[PDB]
């Protein structure tokens, strides 16, 4: 069935999370990132690199892992090896290992949470030269850059700063044939 009406399925299921709760999702995310660094630290491994590996294994078991306008999946093998590198670590570093991953989970389910956050917005767009999908995977980059460049460690809405990057993010792929 049309694969789009297959993802607008999917994400129709996930649960809708309140005000706190993506901001302890966002706290744990950087929690996960400052244990990174230091697994950059060690191991020697460039930072992203890291990221990706472990983002590979929490995407693993996500309820969505297939997700629009992200590039999912590093080279399975590059995994392969980089578990090797990291799961052969000293005691005390398994330890921000595991915060490493609870990191990389939230950060998945932050973003499962507002996939239709996501929808919608695009639901106002369409009609103006780009399809419902071309939309949907403009939103979903404009998700990601949201999660990234957001500062837990305030008294703010996830879901309102969110929907100013999605929002610019979409009209700015339909400024980018015409303005």
């Given at each position: 069935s049309d694969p789009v009406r297959q993802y607008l399925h999917e994400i129709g299921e996930v649960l809708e999370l309140d005000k706190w709760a993506e901001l302890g999702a966002a706290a744990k995310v950087e929690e996960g990132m400052e244990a990174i660094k230091k697994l950059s630290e060690a191991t020697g491994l460039d930072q992203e690199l890291i990221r990706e590996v472990v983002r590979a294994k929490i995407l693993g078991?996500?309820?969505?892992?297939?997700?629009?306008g992200l590039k999912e999946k590093p080279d399975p093998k590059t995994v392969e090896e980089v578990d090797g590198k990291l799961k052969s670590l000293p005691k005390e570093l398994k330890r921000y290992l595991h915060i490493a991953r609870e990191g990389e989970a939230a950060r998945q389910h932050l973003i499962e949470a507002n996939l239709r956050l996501v929808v919608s917005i695009a639901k106002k767009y369409t009609?103006?030269?780009?399809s419902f999908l071309d939309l949907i995977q403009e939103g979903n980059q404009g998700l990601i850059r949201a999660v990234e460049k957001f500062?837990?460690?305030?008294?703010?809405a996830f879901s309102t700063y969110a929907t100013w990057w999605i929002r610019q993010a979409i009209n700015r792929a339909i400024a980018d044939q015409a303005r």
């Open positions: 078991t996500a309820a969505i892992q297939k997700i629009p009609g103006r030269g780009l500062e837990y460690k305030r008294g703010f």
